[PDB]
Write a protein that binds this ligand. Structure first.
Ligand SMILES: *Cc1c(COP(=O)(O)O)cnc(C)c1O
Length: 254
C-alpha cells in the first residue's frame, strides 16, 4: 500500500530519479492516536530539503492532508514520506525533469564506534536526502557488534552523530551537540530538543569535538522522531552514570 501522487500505487516508474540516483529526500514520522507528531516540523524539513536540492513543488497543502488521513487510518505507527525529482532529465542533468513525485506509506543503550566515517560536503549537510548508503554500511558494521547504535565520526575525526539518530552529551550544566554543517542529518527531534534546552536552565552549545572530548561527558543522550529520546549506558570502553538530562527532556519529547 503506497499512496503515490494522489492514488494508491504498488509500483513506481523505473525512470524515476529516486531509483536512478536517489535524487530526492524523505521523512519518517511517529503516528500516535491517529495523529502525526510534529506534523508541521516534518513538512518544513521537506521544504528545505526540496529547496536545497532544487526540487520545485507546490503540493504541500495536498501532501499535508494525505499524511493526516493516512495517520487517522493507521492510528498507531510510522508514516514515511518520500519526494523525488520525478522522471526525466538527460543523465545527471536536472533539465527537462519533473514533475516531482510524492510517496506515502504507513506501518504499525550502548554505542559502538563506527569504522565508517562520513564524507564532508556542505551542500548536502543537514538534508535528509535519499543517498543513505553510508548509513547502510554503518548499520552493517553495527550488527557485527553487540551495540544498539553507533557513534559516527566525520572524515576528519569530528563526532557527528549516530547511524539513525542525533547525539547530545553533557558535563555539569552545559549540554553539547555536534554542528551539522559538513555532515549528518539535522533531525526534527534534535531541533525540538534544542528549543527546549534553549529556554531551559541548561546551557546548550553546538561544537566540533573529537572523540576524546565527548567521552568525558557525565551523560549522553540519543534522539530521533521515533524513539524519541534514548538514555545511553556506555559508549564502548566508557560507562555513563547519570540520566538527569534524559529524565528532563523525555516526558517533554513524548
Ligand atoms: C532521519 C535521520 C536522523 C534523525 O532525524 P529525526 O528527523 O530527528 O527523526 C538522524 N540521522 C540520520 C542519518 C537520519 O537519516
Amino acid at each position: 500500500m503506497f499512496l503515490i501522487n494522489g492514488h494508491k500505487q504498488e509500483s513506481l516508474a523505473v525512470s524515476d530519479r529516486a531509483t536512478q540516483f536517489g535524487d530526492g529526500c524523505f521523512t519518517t514520522a511517529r503516528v500516535i492516536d491517529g495523529k502525526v507528531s510534529l506534523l508541521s516540523a516534518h513538512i518544513q524539513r521537506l521544504q528545505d530539503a526540496c529547496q536545497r536540492l532544487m526540487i520545485s513543488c507546490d503540493f504541500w497543502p495536498q501532501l499535508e492532508q494525505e499524511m493526516k488521513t493516512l495517520a487517522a487510518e493507521q492510528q498507531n505507527g510510522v508514516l514515511k514520506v518520500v519526494i523525488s525529482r520525478g522522471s526525466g532529465g538527460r543523465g545527471y542533468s536536472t533539465l527537462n525533469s519533473g514533475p516531482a513525485t510524492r510517496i506515502l506509506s504507513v506501518t504499525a543503550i550502548t554505542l559502538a564506534l563506527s569504522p565508517v566515517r562520513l564524507g564532508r560536503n556542505p551542500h548536502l549537510a543537514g538534508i535528509k536526502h535519499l543517498n543513505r548508503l553510508e548509513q547502510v554500511l554503518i548499520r552493517s558494521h553495527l550488527e557485527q557488534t553487540n551495540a544498539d547504535e553507533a557513534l559516527v565520526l566525520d572524515s576528519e575525526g569530528w563526532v557527528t552523530e549516530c547511524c539513525a539518530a542525533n547525539l547530545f552529551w553533557r558535563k555539569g550544566n552545559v549540554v553539547y551537540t555536534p554542528r551539522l554543517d559538513q555532515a549528518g542529518v539535522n533531525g526534527i527531534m534534535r531541533q525540538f530538543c534544542i528549543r527546549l534546552l534553549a529556554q531551559s536552565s541548561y546551557q546548550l552549545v553546538e561544537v566540533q569535538a573529537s572523540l576524546e572530548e565527548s567521552l568525558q561527558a557525565d551523560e549522553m543522550v540519543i534522539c530521533n522522531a521515533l524513539m524519541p529520546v534514548m538514555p545511553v549506558c556506555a559508549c564502548g570502553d566508557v560507562s555513563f552514570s547519570s540520566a538527569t538530562l534524559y529524565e528532563y527532556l523525555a516526558p517533554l519529547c513524548e
